[PDB]
Amino acid sequence: ANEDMPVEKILEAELAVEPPNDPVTNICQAADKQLFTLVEWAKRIPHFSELPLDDQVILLRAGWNELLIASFSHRSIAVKDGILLATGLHVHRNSAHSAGVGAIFDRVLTELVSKMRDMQMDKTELGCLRAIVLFNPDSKGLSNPAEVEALREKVYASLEAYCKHKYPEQPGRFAKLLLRLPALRSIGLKCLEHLFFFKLIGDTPIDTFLMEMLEAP
Amino acid sequence: NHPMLMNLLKD
Amino acid sequence: HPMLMNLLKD
Amino acid sequence: AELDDLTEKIRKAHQETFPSLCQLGKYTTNSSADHRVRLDLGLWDKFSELATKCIIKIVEFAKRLPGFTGLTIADQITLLKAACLDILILRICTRYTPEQDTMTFSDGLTLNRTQMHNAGFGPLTDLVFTFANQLLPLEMDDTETGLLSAICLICGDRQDLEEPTKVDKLQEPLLEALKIYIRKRRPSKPHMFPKILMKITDLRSISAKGAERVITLKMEIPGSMPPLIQEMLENSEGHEPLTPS
Ligand SMILES: CC1=C(/C=C/C(C)=C\C=C\C(C)=C\C(=O)O)C(C)(C)CCC1
Ligand SMILES: CC1=C(/C=C/C(C)=C\C=C\C(C)=C\C(=O)O)C(C)(C)CCC1
């Protein structure tokens, strides 16, 4: 079980990657920065590599934002009222609100960061969750969705096992880590909506990588 | 399609 | 919330 | 365990607030069955009524949930306000007939995809039909669908929750019941617990575009949006990025 989705081997992907003026553009930059280092953490993910080409190009363009959000959210367990970007900058909610993204920004703080904090989500659990998000069989175009589903299911496999002999006194650990996933989806969807708004109003400097993930083929 | 990601993935 | 109020009422 | 007095109970509330597809005698209609349009008024009228009824039945199912009752009203209304459209989608999608590509409403009314649309699903349509199919492979049962429904309803994230932690642990056994039950019922496929638990994620995707349809639709309709539908599928506080006043 803990065998084909070697938990501790995802960590070696979590870790093998984990060391302005306007809030939005600081966020959109820490984004485009994190994109590159995402394509990495993936390419270093237990089997992700093997899967077809045009397929990895899909699986990622599919959950890049939720993958990234889950990350910076985890990274911010420590900080009090805001997130901490990959660019080292702390972004407070007051900052968010001035930019009119106060409410989504807040959903991130309470439904994600706070949750992850109030439950000690570890760096492994995180990685599985992101693994799961990474392995989304329903992604359109995927050539042989069959395979991706295999992978993902194999993650619930380890993750539950993993949760099993590591926080044994906690029965529902597993459910509880998975129940942040819908919120991640919910929030990610919204964020995505705002970015398209910041784009088709052409004001925010969106760098090039983030710009590709933001443009259809 | 899309370059940078398509590529980058590889190497 | 008139209705809802009554629905959980009785 | 005795954690099944609860399972057992939910399965009863579901079954009594939502009739099966196999026990319902179906009738069809031809109005708006040939092709899509902004919105067939007859269809809209039937559909809306059922909807109203169903929202009531969902509240009924709600109240029957262990502990739910004992909970703040604004918190209850909130939990329900947040989950209603979620449950509606789950429910209707379990009334899906693959072969015929149709959904059947509580009175047996049986619409094909196009009618499902012309009746008010509009844009939201091929999306709900996807979930409908995504569901078949799971071969869920009543108790499972009852539990799942109860887990969307008893959710502690919903904004504006007075006793979240109460609401959080209130749904703690539900998560356990659903795990045990799916596992005991289908030993060879233990990956069906997370698999069905996670349907909640595509679910919320749809109920999003849902509340959006509630209004973009209560436009094309010459009259008014039925009371309860409104009092349930509305109230969300302006869309961002909107700056502070
Ligand atoms: C959350 C959020 C947004 C979207 C962000 C996305 C899609 C990614 C951020 C990645 C970061 C910030 C990564 C890092 O530094 O690790 C927008 C612009 C709508 C503004 C409000 C808050
Ligand atoms: C309420 C409602 C909507 C969605 C309903 C869904 C998703 C399911 C209904 C199932 C029923 C009403 C089943 C039954 O007869 O048991 C839409 C977005 C179209 C807009 C108008 C109000």
Coordinates of C-alpha atoms and ligand atoms in Angstrom, one line a residue:
Chain A
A1 CA 0.0 0.0 0.0
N2 CA 2.6 2.5 1.3
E3 CA 4.5 0.8 -1.5
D4 CA 3.5 2.1 -4.9
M5 CA 2.8 5.6 -3.6
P6 CA 5.9 5.7 -1.4
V7 CA 4.7 8.5 0.9
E8 CA 8.1 9.6 2.1
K9 CA 9.1 9.7 -1.7
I10 CA 6.6 12.6 -2.4
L11 CA 8.3 14.5 0.5
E12 CA 11.5 14.2 -1.5
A13 CA 9.5 16.3 -4.1
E14 CA 7.9 18.6 -1.5
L15 CA 11.3 19.3 -0.1
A16 CA 13.3 19.0 -3.3
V17 CA 11.5 22.3 -4.1
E18 CA 10.7 23.9 -0.6
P19 CA 13.7 25.7 1.0
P20 CA 6.3 45.3 -5.7
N21 CA 3.9 48.1 -4.9
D22 CA 0.6 46.3 -5.4
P23 CA -0.6 43.1 -3.6
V24 CA -2.1 41.5 -6.7
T25 CA 1.0 41.9 -8.8
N26 CA 3.1 40.5 -5.9
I27 CA 0.8 37.6 -5.7
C28 CA 0.9 37.1 -9.5
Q29 CA 4.7 37.2 -9.4
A30 CA 5.2 34.8 -6.6
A31 CA 2.8 32.8 -8.8
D32 CA 4.7 32.8 -12.1
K33 CA 7.7 32.1 -10.0
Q34 CA 6.1 29.1 -8.4
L35 CA 4.9 27.8 -11.7
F36 CA 8.4 26.8 -12.8
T37 CA 9.3 25.2 -9.5
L38 CA 5.9 23.3 -9.9
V39 CA 6.7 21.6 -13.1
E40 CA 9.6 20.4 -11.1
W41 CA 7.9 19.0 -7.9
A42 CA 5.5 17.2 -10.4
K43 CA 8.3 15.8 -12.6
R44 CA 9.6 14.4 -9.4
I45 CA 6.3 12.9 -8.4
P46 CA 6.0 9.0 -8.0
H47 CA 5.1 8.0 -11.6
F48 CA 3.8 11.4 -12.8
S49 CA 6.9 11.3 -15.0
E50 CA 6.0 8.1 -16.8
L51 CA 2.5 9.2 -17.8
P52 CA 2.3 10.5 -21.5
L53 CA 3.6 13.9 -22.6
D54 CA 0.6 15.9 -23.8
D55 CA -1.0 14.3 -20.6
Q56 CA 1.4 15.9 -18.1
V57 CA 0.9 19.1 -20.0
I58 CA -2.7 18.6 -19.2
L59 CA -2.7 17.2 -15.6
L60 CA -0.8 20.4 -14.7
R61 CA -2.5 23.1 -16.6
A62 CA -5.5 21.6 -14.9
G63 CA -4.6 22.0 -11.2
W64 CA -1.8 24.5 -11.2
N65 CA -3.7 27.2 -9.2
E66 CA -5.2 24.8 -6.6
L67 CA -1.7 23.1 -6.4
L68 CA 0.0 26.5 -5.8
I69 CA -2.7 27.8 -3.4
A70 CA -2.5 24.7 -1.3
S71 CA 1.2 25.3 -1.1
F72 CA 1.4 28.9 -0.2
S73 CA -1.4 28.2 2.3
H74 CA 0.5 25.5 4.0
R75 CA 3.6 27.7 4.0
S76 CA 1.6 30.2 6.0
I77 CA 0.5 28.2 9.0
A78 CA 2.9 30.4 11.0
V79 CA 1.9 33.9 9.9
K80 CA -1.0 35.5 11.6
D81 CA -3.4 37.3 9.3
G82 CA -2.2 36.8 5.8
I83 CA -0.2 34.5 3.6
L84 CA 3.6 34.4 3.0
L85 CA 4.7 34.3 -0.6
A86 CA 7.5 32.3 -2.2
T87 CA 9.1 35.7 -2.9
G88 CA 9.5 36.1 0.8
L89 CA 6.9 38.9 1.1
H90 CA 4.1 38.7 3.8
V91 CA 0.7 39.8 2.5
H92 CA -1.8 40.8 5.1
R93 CA -5.5 40.7 4.7
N94 CA -5.8 44.4 5.0
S95 CA -3.6 44.5 2.0
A96 CA -6.0 42.1 0.2
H97 CA -9.1 44.1 1.0
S98 CA -7.6 47.3 -0.3
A99 CA -7.3 45.4 -3.6
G100 CA -10.9 44.3 -3.5
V101 CA -9.9 40.6 -3.2
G102 CA -10.4 40.8 0.5
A103 CA -13.2 38.1 0.6
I104 CA -11.5 35.4 -1.4
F105 CA -8.3 36.2 0.4
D106 CA -10.2 35.6 3.6
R107 CA -11.6 32.3 2.5
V108 CA -8.0 31.2 2.0
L109 CA -7.1 32.2 5.5
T110 CA -10.0 30.5 7.3
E111 CA -10.9 27.5 5.1
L112 CA -7.3 26.6 4.2
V113 CA -4.5 28.2 6.2
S114 CA -6.3 28.1 9.5
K115 CA -7.7 24.6 8.9
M116 CA -4.2 23.2 8.0
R117 CA -2.9 24.9 11.1
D118 CA -5.6 23.8 13.6
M119 CA -4.9 20.2 12.6
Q120 CA -1.1 20.1 12.2
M121 CA -1.2 19.1 8.6
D122 CA 2.3 17.8 8.0
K123 CA 4.5 18.2 5.0
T124 CA 3.6 14.7 3.8
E125 CA -0.1 14.8 4.1
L126 CA 0.2 18.1 2.2
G127 CA 2.1 16.4 -0.5
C128 CA -0.3 13.5 -1.0
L129 CA -3.3 16.0 -1.1
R130 CA -1.4 17.9 -3.8
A131 CA -0.7 14.5 -5.4
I132 CA -4.3 13.7 -5.5
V133 CA -5.1 17.1 -6.9
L134 CA -2.3 16.5 -9.4
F135 CA -3.7 13.1 -10.5
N136 CA -7.2 14.3 -11.8
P137 CA -8.6 11.6 -14.1
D138 CA -11.5 13.8 -15.1
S139 CA -9.3 16.3 -16.9
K140 CA -10.5 16.8 -20.4
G141 CA -8.3 15.5 -23.3
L142 CA -6.3 13.3 -21.0
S143 CA -5.2 10.3 -23.1
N144 CA -6.0 7.3 -21.1
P145 CA -7.7 8.7 -18.0
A146 CA -7.6 5.2 -16.8
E147 CA -4.0 5.6 -15.7
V148 CA -4.3 8.9 -13.8
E149 CA -7.2 7.4 -11.8
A150 CA -5.0 4.4 -10.9
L151 CA -2.3 6.7 -9.6
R152 CA -4.6 8.9 -7.5
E153 CA -6.4 6.0 -5.9
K154 CA -3.0 4.6 -5.0
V155 CA -2.4 7.9 -3.1
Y156 CA -5.5 7.6 -0.9
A157 CA -3.9 4.2 -0.4
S158 CA -0.7 5.4 1.1
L159 CA -2.1 8.5 2.6
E160 CA -4.6 6.6 4.6
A161 CA -2.0 4.0 5.6
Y162 CA 0.4 6.9 6.2
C163 CA -2.2 8.6 8.4
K164 CA -2.8 5.2 9.9
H165 CA 0.4 4.3 11.7
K166 CA 1.4 7.9 12.2
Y167 CA -1.5 9.6 14.1
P168 CA -3.1 6.2 15.0
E169 CA -5.2 7.7 17.8
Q170 CA -7.0 9.7 15.0
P171 CA -9.7 7.6 13.1
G172 CA -11.1 10.3 10.9
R173 CA -7.7 11.9 10.1
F174 CA -8.1 10.7 6.6
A175 CA -11.6 12.2 5.9
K176 CA -10.6 15.5 7.5
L177 CA -7.6 16.0 5.2
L178 CA -9.7 15.2 2.1
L179 CA -12.4 17.6 3.1
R180 CA -10.1 20.6 2.6
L181 CA -9.9 19.5 -1.0
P182 CA -13.4 20.8 -2.0
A183 CA -12.7 24.1 -0.4
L184 CA -9.4 24.2 -2.3
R185 CA -11.4 23.6 -5.4
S186 CA -14.0 26.2 -4.5
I187 CA -11.4 28.8 -3.7
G188 CA -9.2 28.0 -6.6
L189 CA -12.1 28.4 -8.9
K190 CA -12.8 31.9 -7.6
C191 CA -9.1 32.9 -7.8
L192 CA -9.1 31.8 -11.3
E193 CA -12.1 34.0 -12.0
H194 CA -10.3 37.0 -10.6
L195 CA -7.2 36.4 -12.5
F196 CA -9.1 36.4 -15.8
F197 CA -10.6 39.7 -14.6
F198 CA -7.2 41.2 -13.8
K199 CA -6.2 40.1 -17.3
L200 CA -9.1 41.2 -19.5
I201 CA -8.8 44.6 -17.9
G202 CA -5.1 44.5 -18.9
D203 CA -3.8 46.3 -15.8
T204 CA -1.8 43.8 -13.8
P205 CA 1.6 42.7 -15.1
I206 CA 1.1 39.0 -15.6
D207 CA 4.5 37.4 -16.4
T208 CA 4.8 34.8 -19.2
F209 CA 4.6 31.4 -17.5
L210 CA 1.5 32.4 -15.6
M211 CA 0.3 33.9 -18.8
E212 CA 0.4 30.5 -20.7
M213 CA -1.4 28.7 -17.9
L214 CA -3.9 31.5 -18.4
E215 CA -4.3 31.2 -22.1
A216 CA -6.2 28.4 -23.9
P217 CA -4.4 26.3 -26.6
Chain B
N1 CA 0.6 23.5 -27.9
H2 CA 1.9 25.9 -25.2
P3 CA 5.7 26.1 -25.2
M4 CA 7.5 26.7 -21.8
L5 CA 5.5 24.2 -19.9
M6 CA 5.4 21.6 -22.7
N7 CA 9.2 21.9 -22.9
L8 CA 10.4 22.5 -19.3
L9 CA 8.6 19.4 -18.2
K10 CA 11.1 17.3 -20.2
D11 CA 14.8 18.1 -19.3
Chain C
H1 CA -35.9 34.2 6.1
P2 CA -39.7 33.9 6.7
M3 CA -40.4 30.4 5.2
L4 CA -37.2 28.6 6.3
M5 CA -37.9 30.0 9.7
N6 CA -41.3 28.2 9.8
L7 CA -40.0 25.0 8.1
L8 CA -37.6 24.3 11.0
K9 CA -40.3 25.7 13.4
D10 CA -42.9 22.9 13.8
Chain D
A1 CA -20.5 -0.2 16.3
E2 CA -23.6 1.4 17.8
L3 CA -22.5 4.2 15.5
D4 CA -25.0 2.5 13.2
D5 CA -28.0 3.6 15.0
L6 CA -27.1 6.9 13.3
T7 CA -26.3 5.3 10.0
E8 CA -29.5 3.5 10.1
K9 CA -31.4 6.7 10.9
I10 CA -30.0 8.8 8.1
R11 CA -30.8 6.1 5.5
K12 CA -34.4 6.3 6.8
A13 CA -34.6 10.1 6.4
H14 CA -33.1 10.0 3.0
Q15 CA -35.4 7.3 1.8
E16 CA -38.5 9.1 3.2
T17 CA -37.6 12.5 1.8
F18 CA -36.4 11.2 -1.6
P19 CA -38.1 8.3 -3.5
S20 CA -36.1 5.9 -5.6
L21 CA -35.9 5.9 -9.3
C22 CA -37.2 2.3 -9.4
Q23 CA -40.2 2.9 -7.4
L24 CA -41.4 5.9 -9.3
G25 CA -43.8 5.6 -12.2
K26 CA -42.5 7.8 -15.0
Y27 CA -44.4 10.1 -17.4
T28 CA -42.9 12.2 -20.2
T29 CA -43.9 15.2 -22.2
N30 CA -43.0 16.4 -25.7
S31 CA -43.1 20.2 -25.1
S32 CA -39.5 21.4 -25.8
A33 CA -38.2 18.0 -26.5
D34 CA -36.9 18.6 -30.0
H35 CA -34.3 21.3 -29.3
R36 CA -32.9 23.9 -26.9
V37 CA -34.2 27.4 -26.4
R38 CA -33.8 30.1 -23.8
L39 CA -36.6 28.7 -21.7
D40 CA -39.9 26.8 -22.2
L41 CA -42.3 28.4 -19.7
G42 CA -44.5 25.4 -19.2
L43 CA -41.4 23.2 -18.4
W44 CA -40.2 26.0 -16.2
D45 CA -43.5 26.0 -14.2
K46 CA -43.5 22.3 -13.6
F47 CA -39.9 22.2 -12.7
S48 CA -40.0 25.2 -10.3
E49 CA -42.8 23.6 -8.4
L50 CA -41.0 20.4 -7.9
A51 CA -38.0 22.3 -7.0
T52 CA -39.9 24.1 -4.3
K53 CA -41.2 20.8 -3.0
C54 CA -37.8 19.3 -3.0
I55 CA -36.2 22.2 -1.1
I56 CA -38.9 21.5 1.6
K57 CA -38.1 17.8 1.6
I58 CA -34.4 18.6 2.0
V59 CA -35.2 20.7 5.1
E60 CA -37.3 17.7 6.3
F61 CA -34.2 15.5 5.8
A62 CA -32.2 18.1 7.5
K63 CA -34.3 18.2 10.7
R64 CA -34.2 14.4 10.9
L65 CA -30.4 14.4 11.1
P66 CA -29.0 13.4 14.5
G67 CA -28.0 16.6 16.3
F68 CA -28.9 18.9 13.4
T69 CA -32.0 20.0 15.2
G70 CA -30.1 20.9 18.4
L71 CA -28.2 23.7 16.7
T72 CA -28.5 27.5 16.2
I73 CA -31.1 28.6 13.8
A74 CA -29.0 31.1 11.9
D75 CA -26.4 28.4 11.9
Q76 CA -29.0 25.8 10.6
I77 CA -30.4 28.1 8.0
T78 CA -26.8 28.8 7.1
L79 CA -25.8 25.2 6.8
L80 CA -28.8 24.5 4.6
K81 CA -28.5 27.7 2.7
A82 CA -25.0 26.6 1.8
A83 CA -25.7 23.0 1.0
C84 CA -29.2 23.1 -0.5
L85 CA -28.2 23.3 -4.2
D86 CA -25.5 20.8 -3.4
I87 CA -28.0 18.2 -2.2
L88 CA -30.4 19.0 -5.1
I89 CA -27.8 18.1 -7.7
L90 CA -26.8 14.9 -5.9
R91 CA -30.5 13.9 -5.6
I92 CA -31.5 14.6 -9.2
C93 CA -28.4 12.8 -10.5
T94 CA -29.4 9.7 -8.7
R95 CA -32.7 9.8 -10.9
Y96 CA -30.6 9.4 -14.0
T97 CA -31.5 6.8 -16.6
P98 CA -28.4 6.2 -18.7
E99 CA -30.0 4.2 -21.6
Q100 CA -32.6 6.9 -22.1
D101 CA -30.5 9.9 -21.0
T102 CA -33.1 11.3 -18.7
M103 CA -33.8 12.5 -15.2
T104 CA -36.9 11.8 -13.3
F105 CA -38.4 14.2 -10.8
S106 CA -40.3 13.2 -7.7
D107 CA -43.7 13.0 -9.4
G108 CA -42.1 10.8 -12.1
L109 CA -41.9 13.6 -14.5
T110 CA -39.2 12.4 -16.9
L111 CA -37.2 14.9 -19.0
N112 CA -34.5 14.2 -21.6
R113 CA -31.3 16.4 -21.6
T114 CA -32.8 19.1 -23.9
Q115 CA -35.9 19.4 -21.6
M116 CA -33.7 19.3 -18.6
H117 CA -32.2 22.4 -20.2
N118 CA -35.3 24.1 -21.6
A119 CA -36.7 23.8 -18.1
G120 CA -34.1 26.0 -16.5
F121 CA -30.8 24.1 -16.1
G122 CA -29.7 25.9 -19.2
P123 CA -25.8 26.1 -19.2
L124 CA -25.6 24.1 -16.0
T125 CA -26.9 21.1 -17.9
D126 CA -24.3 18.9 -19.6
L127 CA -22.4 19.6 -16.3
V128 CA -25.0 17.9 -14.1
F129 CA -25.4 15.0 -16.6
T130 CA -21.6 14.5 -16.3
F131 CA -21.9 14.1 -12.6
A132 CA -24.8 11.8 -13.3
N133 CA -22.5 9.5 -15.2
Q134 CA -19.6 10.1 -12.9
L135 CA -21.9 8.6 -10.3
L136 CA -22.9 5.3 -11.9
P137 CA -19.5 3.6 -11.5
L138 CA -19.8 4.2 -7.8
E139 CA -23.0 2.1 -7.5
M140 CA -23.9 4.0 -4.4
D141 CA -26.9 3.0 -2.4
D142 CA -29.5 4.9 -0.4
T143 CA -27.6 4.8 2.9
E144 CA -24.5 6.0 1.1
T145 CA -26.3 8.8 -0.7
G146 CA -28.0 9.6 2.6
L147 CA -24.8 9.9 4.4
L148 CA -23.1 11.9 1.7
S149 CA -26.0 14.3 1.6
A150 CA -25.8 14.6 5.4
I151 CA -22.0 15.4 5.1
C152 CA -22.6 18.3 2.7
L153 CA -25.2 19.6 5.0
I154 CA -23.4 19.2 8.2
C155 CA -20.3 21.2 7.2
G156 CA -18.2 23.4 9.5
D157 CA -16.5 25.7 6.8
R158 CA -19.6 27.6 5.8
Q159 CA -19.0 31.3 6.6
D160 CA -21.2 32.8 9.4
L161 CA -21.1 29.8 11.7
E162 CA -21.7 30.5 15.4
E163 CA -20.6 27.1 16.7
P164 CA -18.4 25.8 13.8
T165 CA -16.5 23.3 16.1
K166 CA -19.8 21.9 17.2
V167 CA -20.9 21.6 13.6
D168 CA -17.5 20.2 12.8
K169 CA -17.6 17.4 15.3
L170 CA -21.3 16.9 14.6
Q171 CA -20.2 15.6 11.2
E172 CA -17.3 13.6 12.7
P173 CA -19.2 10.3 13.0
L174 CA -20.9 10.8 9.6
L175 CA -17.5 10.7 8.1
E176 CA -16.8 7.5 10.1
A177 CA -20.2 5.9 9.4
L178 CA -19.8 6.5 5.6
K179 CA -16.2 5.0 5.8
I180 CA -17.2 1.9 7.8
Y181 CA -20.4 1.3 5.8
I182 CA -18.9 1.6 2.3
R183 CA -16.0 -0.6 3.4
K184 CA -18.1 -3.4 5.1
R185 CA -20.5 -3.3 2.1
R186 CA -17.8 -3.6 -0.6
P187 CA -14.7 -5.3 0.8
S188 CA -12.9 -5.8 -2.5
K189 CA -13.0 -2.0 -3.3
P190 CA -11.9 -0.1 -0.1
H191 CA -10.9 2.8 -2.3
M192 CA -14.6 3.6 -2.6
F193 CA -14.8 5.6 0.6
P194 CA -12.4 8.3 -0.5
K195 CA -13.7 8.0 -4.1
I196 CA -17.3 8.8 -3.1
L197 CA -16.3 11.2 -0.4
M198 CA -14.5 13.3 -3.0
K199 CA -17.5 13.6 -5.3
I200 CA -18.3 16.4 -3.0
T201 CA -15.6 18.4 -4.8
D202 CA -17.1 18.2 -8.3
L203 CA -20.4 18.8 -6.5
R204 CA -19.5 22.2 -5.1
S205 CA -18.1 23.1 -8.5
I206 CA -21.6 22.7 -10.0
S207 CA -23.6 24.2 -7.1
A208 CA -21.4 27.3 -7.7
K209 CA -22.4 27.8 -11.3
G210 CA -25.8 26.9 -9.8
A211 CA -26.4 29.9 -7.6
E212 CA -25.3 31.9 -10.6
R213 CA -28.0 30.3 -12.8
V214 CA -30.6 31.1 -10.1
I215 CA -30.4 34.7 -11.1
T216 CA -29.2 34.7 -14.7
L217 CA -32.4 32.7 -15.1
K218 CA -34.9 34.6 -12.8
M219 CA -34.4 37.1 -15.5
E220 CA -35.7 35.3 -18.6
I221 CA -38.8 34.4 -16.6
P222 CA -41.8 36.8 -17.2
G223 CA -43.2 36.3 -13.6
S224 CA -41.3 35.9 -10.3
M225 CA -38.9 33.4 -8.7
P226 CA -40.9 31.1 -6.3
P227 CA -40.5 32.2 -2.7
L228 CA -38.6 29.3 -1.1
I229 CA -36.3 28.9 -4.1
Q230 CA -35.3 32.6 -3.5
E231 CA -35.1 32.3 0.3
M232 CA -32.7 29.4 -0.3
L233 CA -30.6 30.0 -3.4
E234 CA -29.9 33.7 -2.8
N235 CA -28.2 36.1 -0.4
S236 CA -24.4 36.0 -1.1
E237 CA -23.0 39.5 -0.7
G238 CA -21.6 41.2 -3.8
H239 CA -18.9 39.9 -6.2
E240 CA -15.2 40.8 -6.2
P241 CA -12.9 42.5 -6.8
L242 CA -15.1 45.1 -5.2
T243 CA -13.4 47.8 -3.1
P244 CA -14.7 48.8 0.4
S245 CA -17.1 51.5 1.3
Ligands
LIG1 C1 -5.0 33.7 -3.8 C2 -5.3 34.9 -4.7 C3 -5.2 35.1 -6.1 C4 -4.7 34.0 -7.0 C5 -3.5 33.3 -6.9 C6 -3.0 32.2 -7.5 C7 -3.7 31.5 -8.6 C8 -1.7 31.8 -7.2 C9 -0.8 32.3 -6.2 C10 0.4 31.7 -5.9 C11 1.4 32.2 -4.9 C12 1.2 33.5 -4.1 C13 2.4 31.4 -4.7 C14 3.6 31.5 -3.8 O1 4.2 32.6 -3.5 O2 4.0 30.4 -3.3 C15 -5.6 36.4 -6.8 C16 -4.6 37.0 -7.8 C17 -6.9 36.3 -7.6 C18 -5.8 37.6 -5.8 C19 -6.4 37.2 -4.4 C20 -5.8 36.0 -3.8
LIG2 C1 -33.7 24.7 -7.6 C2 -33.1 25.3 -8.9 C3 -32.1 24.8 -9.8 C4 -31.4 23.4 -9.6 C5 -31.9 22.2 -9.3 C6 -31.2 20.9 -9.2 C7 -29.8 20.8 -9.4 C8 -32.0 19.8 -8.9 C9 -33.4 19.6 -8.6 C10 -33.9 18.4 -8.4 C11 -35.4 18.3 -8.0 C12 -36.3 19.4 -7.9 C13 -35.7 17.0 -7.9 C14 -37.0 16.3 -7.5 O1 -38.1 16.5 -8.2 O2 -36.8 15.5 -6.6 C15 -31.6 25.6 -11.1 C16 -30.1 25.9 -11.2 C17 -32.0 24.9 -12.4 C18 -32.2 27.0 -11.1 C19 -33.6 27.3 -10.5 C20 -33.7 26.7 -9.1

